[PDB]
Write a protein that binds this DNA or RNA. Structure first.
Ligand SMILES: [Cl-]
Ligand SMILES: [Cl-]
Ligand SMILES: [Mg+2]
Ligand code: NA
Ligand code: NA
Ligand code: NA
Length: 326
DNA sequence: CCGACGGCGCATCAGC
DNA sequence: GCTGATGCGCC
DNA sequence: GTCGG
């Protein structure tokens, strides 16, 4: 972290634009600049030096010059002092409360943790659980715990049906020493792009993880995506482990590589890679890579037998998961 | 200048 | 009920 | 806010 000061500044700006301004492209612009600066292997001496990086323009260069000169950004100083902006930013830290709901709550005079707690009746289910575990959800997960969580999930899935394959993706697969949550990609031979030969494939897995008290709450759940909460078991007399967020995504088995590419991320890496695909005449999602016809309409799925096949199509050298932490 | 900016699952709501 | 928009989430 | 044409 040679440039932690700058990247933190840009992240704060991004969060302001997302949460308060509701300007999603400005949010993406700031995070893209933070990410490109984050991997730049020199301690940045000036805005002009930064502007040479893709994603960094005149405005960010100017902000970087102010930040280097003074150690701060007046624009952010003012944002931090602003009660409404501060309140809105706080509320969005609850899972299920986004920029729109946060601003609505603040309009109603709900703007602190205490306010939320006494107004549970005003929260949807997702928001209710996000509040319940507010503190827990902001803690990181040590890789050692991620390994214990992996062992439980893979073993319980095996107990349901030996043909399931569960793969922990997200920051974990990129080799992170700590993760924000647990992401599990799931496949089963009965669910392919050609057919669904068994119903409840995701449900049966969630059910089993609930039965053993690993999954403790549900934020949302459909045929192919579960979003919930889980907890490691603790030993006699041991303090409990924090509750953790868990996402499970069931992907057609024949679309595993696009699926695991997607779910491995990072999010910015995916945006960068998908944008590069477009420039190359392809579109990539978690299922397929397809060509763009002249009209600019997606064609048929291209054959994919490896993650690397996808990089090849868009003329990128392969990048190992550990090198996708953008 | 100016359009594009990644792609999509689930929850919720408006309109019919 | 449905469909389509929108909010919020995931990487 | 930044880029590409
Ligand atoms: Cl915007
Ligand atoms: Cl597709
Ligand atoms: Mg994750
Ligand atoms: Na630049
Ligand atoms: Na939130
Ligand atoms: Na996740």
């Amino acid at each position: 972290t040679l440039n932690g000061g700058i990247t933190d500044m840009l992240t704060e700006l991004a969060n302001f634009e997302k949460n308060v301004s509701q300007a999603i492209h400005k949010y993406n612009a700031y995070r893209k600049a933070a990410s490109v600066i984050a991997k730049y292997p020199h301690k940045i001496k000036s805005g002009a030096e930064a502007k040479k990086l893709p994603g960094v323009g005149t405005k960010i260069a100017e902000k970087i010059d102010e930040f280097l000169a003074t150690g701060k950004l007046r624009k952010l100083e003012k944002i931090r002092q602003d009660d409404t902006s501060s309140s809105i930013n706080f509320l969005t830290r609850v899972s299920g409360i986004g920029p729109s709901a946060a601003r609505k709550f603040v309009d109603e005079g709900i703007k602190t943790l205490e306010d939320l707690r006494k107004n549970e009746d005003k929260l949807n289910h997702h928001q209710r659980i996000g509040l319940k575990y507010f503190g827990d959800f902001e803690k990181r997960i040590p890789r050692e715990e991620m390994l214990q969580m992996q062992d439980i999930v893979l073993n319980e899935v095996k107990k349901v049906d030996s043909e399931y394959i569960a793969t922990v993706c997200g920051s974990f697969r990129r080799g992170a020493e700590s993760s924000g949550d647990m992401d599990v990609l799931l496949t089963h031979p009965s669910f392919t792009s050609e057919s669904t030969k068994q119903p409840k494939l995701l449900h049966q897995v969630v059910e089993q993880l609930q039965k053993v008290h690993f999954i403790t709450d549900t934020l949302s759940k459909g045929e192919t995506k579960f979003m919930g909460v889980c907890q490691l078991p603790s030993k006699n007399d041991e303090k409990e482990y924090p509750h953790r967020r868990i996402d499970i995504r069931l992907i057609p088995k024949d679309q595993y590589y696009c699926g695991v590419l997607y779910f491995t991320g990072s999010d910015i890496f995916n945006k960068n890679m998908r944008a590069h695909a477009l420039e190359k005449g392809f579109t990539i999602n978690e299922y397929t890579i397809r060509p763009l016809g002249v009209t600019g309409v997606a064609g048929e799925p291209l054959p994919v037998d490896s993650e690397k096949d996808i990089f090849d199509y868009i003329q990128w050298k392969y990048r190992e998961p550990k090198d996708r932490s953008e």
